[PDB]
Amino acid sequence: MSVEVKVTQIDDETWKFKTTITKENGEKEEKESTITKEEVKESYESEEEYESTKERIRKKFEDLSEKEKYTLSNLVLAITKKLKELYEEYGAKEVKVTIEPINGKPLDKETKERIKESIEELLKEKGYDVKVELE
Numbered sequence: 830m831s832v833e834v835k836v837t838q839i840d841d842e843t844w845k846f847k848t849t850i851t852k853e854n855g856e857k858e859e860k861e862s863t864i865t866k867e868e869v870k871e872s873y874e875s876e877e878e879y880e881s882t883k884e885r886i887r888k889k890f891e892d893l894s895e896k897e898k899y900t901l902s903n904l905v906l907a908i909t910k911k912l913k914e915l916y917e918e919y920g921a922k923e924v925k926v927t928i929e930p931i932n933g934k935p936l937d938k939e940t941k942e943r944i945k946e947s948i949e950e951l952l953k954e955k956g957y958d959v960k961v962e963l964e
Contacts, residue, residue: 832921836908837929842866844907869906889943900931909951916957927964
């Protein structure tokens with residue numbers, strides 16, 4: 830059950846996803862979906878837990894600027910919700926994610942390792958043991 834996800838931030842409230850699913854027997858599955866900031870916010874048990882989770886991811890990038898902490902923390906929440914849905918649909922224990930550059934600044938190695946850790950941490954806390962690989 831190969832899972833490859835392409836992430837494109839349309840705006841600061843919209844994230845577009847394109848996923849390719851490759852099964853062991855050769856069945857391929859091409860999918861598109863758009864997740865909004867409001868849908869990420871409403872997927873949490875409460876407004877308090879949503880803003881608490883957002884603070885934790887911001888704390889992962891305290892060395893970065895306020896604009897970058899705003900983009901990266903909300904980006905992690907969107908991708909985490911997506912990989913959460915994919916794990917409920919296919920049960921894959923490994924996902925490969927490719928993120929398009931946001932506002933003319935590609936992700937460097939330290940930021941990608943932090944994003945990977947943040948997503949895996951949020952997934953493991955909901956009982957989803959998923960290895961995230963960022964291309």
